[model samples]
Target: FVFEDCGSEVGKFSDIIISSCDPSEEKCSIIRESEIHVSMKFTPSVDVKNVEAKAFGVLLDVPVPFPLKKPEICKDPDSGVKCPLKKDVEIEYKVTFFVEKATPALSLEIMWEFRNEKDEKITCVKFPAKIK
Candidate 1:
């Protein structure tokens, strides 16, 4: 994963680039059972309070012979924590790409957080992923 500044002159918005270097050349040995788990962690950047966030994932399987659907935001019914509102928010997304007999050349997962400036606990996490 890579961390990159949005380069906004106002420095109001920022983003993190999430990626996996694991070789995708090997085909799934278990048909549709092969799965990958991706997650995102957010730490306070500006101490924002009463903030709300929504996250979702995206999958890119290029030159595939079949159709695919995008991933949706993961929700927890008991916790009632739809998004990361406080300083730090951690979320995970899981999915299985049907690699019938071939592996995907590339795949990506993205998680986003939104916060209002009115809060005092809203901030950006520093170096969420170690990039090489």
Candidate 2:
């Protein structure tokens, strides 16, 4: 993943595993811009409170798809959606959004605003993903 503000590469897991895609779904990362679920092999460095997600048409160079306001992302049932996740443990979450069939392949930005026990923004987790 790359940074949206500075276009710098962040952490990238080469061996990341992605399941749950339908058999007939496009083999490429070319999803329908619908609900996308993911699992992380690492735990959150800090507790997360809210999430901001959006999409951009990389090829078209514009915000093409849908725009989401603050969304609830820490719905991991196993974690009980609590704070202070187990250090260096596995985690999972799902993001659901809509896009027109006319929407082109592009990049999606997901940012998590991590808050502390006092409900203050303490950390952030961001992912800028291309449709590769």
Candidate 3:
């Protein structure tokens, strides 16, 4: 999915692109029971707290705030605690994750936390898909 500035020009989104949808090759959004690859780029107008992903009633938190499983994504390195990310630089993240289980007919939510605040959900894209 792509992110739009949405009238505020508050931030930028992935020059790249996630999925789980139709099975047809022409409209491939299938979230296989194996793995999911998500790569995105960001240029924030201000520092953001975190970017969250939720699906299957689980908080699929990015490998931050801890020992770096997906290293180099977060600037803090989460070497101990959550760290701050600088603004203006092109923060690029290209990571792959796995979903061992998912029910047919499902939705995925992407939540963002900007300026260390909440309730201000800027982008939450939903993809309707079925188990392949």
Q: Which numbered prediction scores highest in lDDT against the true structure?
A: 3
Candidate 1 residue spans exceeding 4 A from truth: 1-33, 44-84, 88-132
Q: By TM-score, is 2 or 3 better? A: 3
lDDT by residue for model 3 (65-94), tens? 222244323433422224354555556555
All candidates in order of lDDT, best leading: 3, 2, 1
Candidate RMSDs in order: 9.7, 7.3, 7.9
TM-score of each: 0.29, 0.37, 0.47
Per-prediction backbone clash count: 15, 0, 2
Writing each residue's lDDT as its tens digit, candidate 1 over 1-132 gives: 243232212113333222332323231122222343333344444333344333333436322122234322224333223443433344333333333335444333333333444422232222222112
Better model by lDDT: candidate 1 vs candidate 2? 2
Task: Note the Cα lDDT for every prediction shown.
Answer: 0.32, 0.39, 0.41
- Lowest lDDT 10-mer window, candidate 3? 63-72
Model 2 lowest lDDT segment of ten: 6-15
Cand. 3 Cα-lDDT: 0.41
Q: lDDT of model 2 at residue 45?
A: 42
- Compose the digit string of candidate 2's lDDT tens values, residues 46-67: 4344422233333344434444
Cα RMSD for predicted model 3 = 7.9
